[PDB]
Design an enzyme around this catalytic site. Structure first.
Site, PDB file in Angstrom:
ATOM      1  CG  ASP A  64     -37.553 -58.862  50.401  1.00  0.00           C
ATOM      2  OD1 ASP A  64     -38.009 -57.763  50.788  1.00  0.00           O
ATOM      3  OD2 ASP A  64     -36.605 -58.947  49.587  1.00  0.00           O
ATOM      4  CB  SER A 110     -34.244 -57.353  47.400  1.00  0.00           C
ATOM      5  OG  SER A 110     -35.612 -57.151  47.723  1.00  0.00           O
ATOM      6  CD1 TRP A 157     -42.221 -54.828  44.875  1.00  0.00           C
ATOM      7  CD2 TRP A 157     -40.848 -56.213  45.983  1.00  0.00           C
ATOM      8  NE1 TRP A 157     -41.374 -55.402  43.953  1.00  0.00           N
ATOM      9  CE2 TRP A 157     -40.522 -56.256  44.605  1.00  0.00           C
ATOM     10  CE3 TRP A 157     -40.114 -57.006  46.876  1.00  0.00           C
ATOM     11  CZ2 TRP A 157     -39.494 -57.063  44.100  1.00  0.00           C
ATOM     12  CZ3 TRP A 157     -39.090 -57.809  46.375  1.00  0.00           C
ATOM     13  CH2 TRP A 157     -38.790 -57.830  44.998  1.00  0.00           C
ATOM     14  CB  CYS A 168     -38.214 -62.700  47.615  1.00  0.00           C
ATOM     15  SG  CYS A 168     -37.737 -61.090  46.986  1.00  0.00           S
TER      16      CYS A 168
HETATM   17  C1  FAD Z   1     -38.964 -53.867  50.337  1.00  0.00           C
HETATM   18  C2  FAD Z   1     -38.991 -53.655  48.963  1.00  0.00           C
HETATM   19  C3  FAD Z   1     -38.115 -54.348  48.134  1.00  0.00           C
HETATM   20  C4  FAD Z   1     -38.146 -54.149  46.758  1.00  0.00           C
HETATM   21  N1  FAD Z   1     -37.272 -54.789  45.968  1.00  0.00           N
HETATM   22  C5  FAD Z   1     -37.267 -54.554  44.649  1.00  0.00           C
HETATM   23  C6  FAD Z   1     -36.358 -55.207  43.823  1.00  0.00           C
HETATM   24  O1  FAD Z   1     -35.397 -55.811  44.301  1.00  0.00           O
HETATM   25  N2  FAD Z   1     -36.469 -55.093  42.434  1.00  0.00           N
HETATM   26  C7  FAD Z   1     -37.486 -54.314  41.865  1.00  0.00           C
HETATM   27  O2  FAD Z   1     -37.609 -54.248  40.646  1.00  0.00           O
HETATM   28  N3  FAD Z   1     -38.383 -53.639  42.704  1.00  0.00           N
HETATM   29  C8  FAD Z   1     -38.276 -53.777  44.092  1.00  0.00           C
HETATM   30  N4  FAD Z   1     -39.032 -53.005  44.889  1.00  0.00           N
HETATM   31  C9  FAD Z   1     -39.943 -52.021  44.260  1.00  0.00           C
HETATM   32  C10 FAD Z   1     -39.215 -50.682  44.105  1.00  0.00           C
HETATM   33  O3  FAD Z   1     -38.962 -50.125  45.399  1.00  0.00           O
HETATM   34  C11 FAD Z   1     -40.021 -49.676  43.279  1.00  0.00           C
HETATM   35  O4  FAD Z   1     -41.365 -49.619  43.765  1.00  0.00           O
HETATM   36  C12 FAD Z   1     -40.038 -50.059  41.797  1.00  0.00           C
HETATM   37  O5  FAD Z   1     -38.699 -50.179  41.311  1.00  0.00           O
HETATM   38  C13 FAD Z   1     -40.769 -48.969  41.010  1.00  0.00           C
HETATM   39  O6  FAD Z   1     -40.205 -47.692  41.330  1.00  0.00           O
HETATM   40  P1  FAD Z   1     -40.193 -46.492  40.258  1.00  0.00           P
HETATM   41  O7  FAD Z   1     -39.785 -45.258  40.970  1.00  0.00           O
HETATM   42  O8  FAD Z   1     -39.417 -46.917  39.074  1.00  0.00           O
HETATM   43  O9  FAD Z   1     -41.735 -46.385  39.803  1.00  0.00           O
HETATM   44  P2  FAD Z   1     -42.775 -45.334  40.441  1.00  0.00           P
HETATM   45  O10 FAD Z   1     -42.650 -44.032  39.747  1.00  0.00           O
HETATM   46  O11 FAD Z   1     -42.642 -45.381  41.913  1.00  0.00           O
HETATM   47  O12 FAD Z   1     -44.175 -45.995  40.003  1.00  0.00           O
HETATM   48  C14 FAD Z   1     -44.676 -47.149  40.681  1.00  0.00           C
HETATM   49  C15 FAD Z   1     -46.188 -47.221  40.461  1.00  0.00           C
HETATM   50  O13 FAD Z   1     -46.494 -47.345  39.066  1.00  0.00           O
HETATM   51  C16 FAD Z   1     -47.837 -47.850  39.010  1.00  0.00           C
HETATM   52  N5  FAD Z   1     -47.853 -48.888  37.957  1.00  0.00           N
HETATM   53  C17 FAD Z   1     -46.754 -49.817  37.625  1.00  0.00           C
HETATM   54  N6  FAD Z   1     -47.343 -50.526  36.471  1.00  0.00           N
HETATM   55  C18 FAD Z   1     -48.581 -50.078  36.276  1.00  0.00           C
HETATM   56  C19 FAD Z   1     -49.469 -50.436  35.351  1.00  0.00           C
HETATM   57  N7  FAD Z   1     -49.056 -51.330  34.458  1.00  0.00           N
HETATM   58  N8  FAD Z   1     -50.720 -49.953  35.325  1.00  0.00           N
HETATM   59  C20 FAD Z   1     -51.108 -49.041  36.312  1.00  0.00           C
HETATM   60  N9  FAD Z   1     -50.154 -48.684  37.271  1.00  0.00           N
HETATM   61  C21 FAD Z   1     -48.918 -49.203  37.226  1.00  0.00           C
HETATM   62  C22 FAD Z   1     -48.136 -48.433  40.385  1.00  0.00           C
HETATM   63  O14 FAD Z   1     -48.961 -47.527  41.131  1.00  0.00           O
HETATM   64  C23 FAD Z   1     -46.758 -48.511  41.017  1.00  0.00           C
HETATM   65  O15 FAD Z   1     -46.889 -48.381  42.439  1.00  0.00           O
HETATM   66  C24 FAD Z   1     -39.041 -53.233  46.209  1.00  0.00           C
HETATM   67  C25 FAD Z   1     -39.926 -52.551  47.038  1.00  0.00           C
HETATM   68  C26 FAD Z   1     -39.902 -52.759  48.412  1.00  0.00           C
HETATM   69  C27 FAD Z   1     -40.763 -52.042  49.235  1.00  0.00           C
END
Ligand code: FAD
Ligand code: NAP
Ligand code: FMN
EC number: 1.6.2.4
Length: 609
Positions: free
Chosen positions: A606, A393, A608, A561
């Protein structure tokens, strides 16, 4: 507005296909399911193809009956406020406006959704209902996949009943491994023709040319990357991306998407354990020369580049992936476990859910824990899903920062039951970006989360934790509006964190905005500073009288949010309770009242998970 392909029906006729599966997908899940169903067709003596509805005119559905024993399947995900995915918007609009006669058309729909959202599987439900209203006949029940439980299992269960239903209806009937791509190794390839991480046109990352979007991301320079939280329990960061000279436009409330790179150590180990040379330049070419999908990802390229920028190597592999890989496990017991992962029940299903999903085992973890599993690198690359962009966001206002997009994110790093520490792909990558040149491929996606058009309209913002992100942009803008002499209505922030000295995000900035009056109220719930939990909804209940006045009499707009799993629902329940007490009115009418606000654009989400 893309240029439509010629009739998909004519394409089916010329290629001998009788089944076509369309995918309404945003992050690739529906696309993968569609590819799987398309490939399943072959095992039942039929032939299928998967297709992006955006590339075609679904009006040609009326010609599908020209093909004997034909069938169309739709794997459709739902998005923002029960809307179709971006690639299915055209189809959705056509469905609402068309009056075409679909007599003779046979269809089935598998919806991908999440029960924690307001309109659960709205798109799948709509398509299923509409095709029947247009005269088509349903050949199998609507599937309602729920990502809040386990979507893969819902798909498996549906698919297991779908095929027999199709075989019985068409009078057809049902065992080998078939590849979609052929490997072509390139010895003396010109470097200019080799992809190194770009998403669309070759060298598009090197030679940047607007307009920029998902297919052509802008490489933004990271100008700031600072730690936001005071404590060390976790790592919360603020990043500032320079979009100068990109011609990109954005408003507070929009989202910024980024294309990350996987961890090099993980990529290295996958190559190491498979005994493969990751620097081999190659291409995976579709064995179906007619398909528009010539490669699984940009080619030619090296395996290293594919595993780093194009493939998802961190999420738990889906059952079909494990099933196809079983053939490469030389230990009978390991081959048996991998095969049984695709079971719709029993011990095989229980093992998939606990040992793969719950344990969060990624492909490397599986290769390590089932040591006899040694597949050739090329086939694995054909099986892995594509690496998706991550959305954030935008935490800034373009009225204040027209040439910079700000991101507020929590770094993902946790101990999995698999025994290893899993790292979030995008957040680990972003955290390592050091200003001055650190570039981040990105693009902006317009959202429907927006400040009121009238500056005088009151705003109630609820965003605990990283849910504060869009509101920093909102507050910057409302402050700017006041500085411009405009009359700004009340601006209230309901924020929440664990402890004021651990993770109170933007503490200083918020203090400033409050002192200057940009924030009429700064209500912060410190959940762990006392024995009991204090959350934002407790503060909303505390201020029920005033909030009701603002909502019912002042026409205030509400914004929520953050966590879509629990917080959003608990907050919604509190607003129900407020409306119910001051209306006054019963719970049922309170719920309806709040639902209306959402339809009237006065209650925006907003969230997620
Ligand atoms: C519309 C929208 C807005 C968003 N806005 C933001 C934002 O502003 N700020 C923000 O920080 N994120 C936000 N996100 C989330 C962001 O897009 C990512 O999903 C987040 O940053 C994680 O991405 P990554 O690639 O670092 O982790 P990834 O490699 O994608 O891993 C994510 C996955 O790790 C697993 N996981 C996390 N913790 C654990 C746990 N403790 N135990 C078991 N499984 C776990 C879950 O399956 C999670 O889905 C938003 C998402 C959407 C869809
Ligand atoms: O990661 P992140 O950015 O989401 O931050 P986070 O630190 O996980 O959550 C932010 C704040 O929300 C609180 N919270 C937890 N559950 C809630 C709920 N059900 N309703 C309202 N607030 C809740 C958390 O308190 P606790 O973590 O103390 O529950 C914390 O104070
Ligand atoms: C921003 C966002 C909004 C969503 N909105 C809804 C929704 O309104 N209704 C629903 O049933 N599911 C909703 N979902 C869940 C998705 O439909 C589900 O995760 C689906 O598996 C995604 O498929 P895809 O990867 O093919 O796009 C949403 C997910 C995100 C990330």
């Amino acid at each position: 507005p893309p240029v439509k392909e010629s009739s998909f029906v004519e394409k089916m006729k010329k290629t001998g296909r009788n089944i076509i599966v369309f995918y309404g997908s945003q992050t690739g899940t529906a696309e993968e399911f569609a590819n799987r169903l398309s490939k399943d067709a072959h095992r039942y003596g039929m032939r299928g193809m998967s297709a992006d509805p955006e590339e075609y005119d679904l009006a040609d559905l009326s010609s599908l009956p020209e093909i004997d024993k034909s069938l169309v399947v739709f794997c459709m995900a739902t998005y923002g406020e029960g809307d179709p995915t971006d690639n299915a918007q055209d189809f959705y609009d056509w469905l609402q406006e068309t009056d075409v006669d679909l007599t003779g058309v046979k269809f089935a729909v598998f919806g991908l959704g999440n029960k924690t959202y307001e309109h659960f599987n709205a798109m799948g439900k709509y398509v299923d209902q509409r095709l029947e209203q247009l005269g088509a006949q349903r050949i199998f029940e609507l599937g309602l996949g729920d990502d809040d439980g386990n979507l893969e299992e819902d798909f498996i269960t549906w698919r297991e009943q779908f095929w027999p239903a199709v075989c019985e209806f068409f009078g057809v009937e049902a065992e080998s491994s078939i590849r979609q791509y052929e490997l072509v190794v390139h010895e003396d390839m010109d470097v200019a023709k080799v992809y190194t991480g770009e998403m669309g046109r070759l060298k598009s990352y090197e030679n940047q040319k607007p307009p920029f979007d998902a297919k052509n991301p802008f490489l933004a320079a990271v100008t700031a990357n600072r730690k936001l939280n005071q404590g060390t329990e976790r790592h919360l960061m603020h990043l500032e991306l320079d979009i100068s000279d990109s011609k990109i436009r954005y408003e507070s409330g929009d989202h910024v998407a980024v294309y990350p790179a996987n961890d090099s150590a993980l990529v290295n180990q996958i190559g190491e354990i498979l005994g493969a040379d990751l620097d081999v330049i190659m291409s995976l070419n579709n064995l179906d020369e007619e398909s528009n999908k010539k490669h699984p990802f940009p080619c030619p390229t090296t395996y290293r580049t594919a595993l780093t920028y194009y493939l998802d190597i961190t999420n738990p592999p889906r059952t079909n992936v494990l099933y196809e890989l079983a053939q490469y496990a030389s230990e009978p017991s390991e081959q048996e476990h991998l095969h049984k992962m695709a079971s719709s029940s029993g011990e095989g299903k229980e093992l998939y859910l606990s040992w793969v999903v719950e344990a969060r085992r990624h492909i490397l973890a599986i290769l390590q824990d089932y040591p006899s599993l040694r597949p050739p690198i090329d086939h694995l690359c054909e099986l892995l899903p594509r690496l998706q962009a991550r959305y954030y966001s935008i935490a800034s206002s373009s009225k204040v920062h027209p040439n910079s997009v700000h991101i507020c994110a929590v770094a993902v790093e946790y101990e999995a039951k698999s025994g290893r520490v899993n790292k979030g792909v995008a957040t680990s990558w972003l955290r390592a970006k050091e200003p001055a040149r650190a570039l981040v491929p990105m693009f902006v996606r317009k959202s429907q989360f927006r400040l009121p058009f009238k500056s005088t309209t009151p705003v109630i913002m609820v965003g605990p934790g990283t849910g504060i992100a869009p509101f920093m942009g909102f507050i910057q803008e409302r402050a700017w509006l006041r500085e411009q002499g405009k009359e700004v209505g009340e601006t209230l922030l309901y924020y929440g964190c664990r402890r004021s000295d651990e993770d109170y995000l933007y503490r200083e900035e918020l203090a400033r905005f409050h002192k200057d009056g940009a924030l009429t109220q700064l209500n912060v719930a410190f959940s762990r500073e006392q024995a009991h939990k204090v959350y934002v909804q407790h503060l909303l209940k505390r201020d029920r009288e005033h909030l009701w006045k603002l909502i019912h009499e002042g026409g205030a707009h509400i914004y929520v949010c953050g966590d879509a799993r629990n917080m959003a629902k608990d907050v919604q329940n509190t607003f129900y309770d407020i409306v119910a007490e001051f209306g006054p009115m019963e719970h049922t009418q309170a719920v309806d009242y709040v639902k209306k606000l959402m339809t009237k654009g006065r209650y925006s989400l907003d969230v997620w998970s």
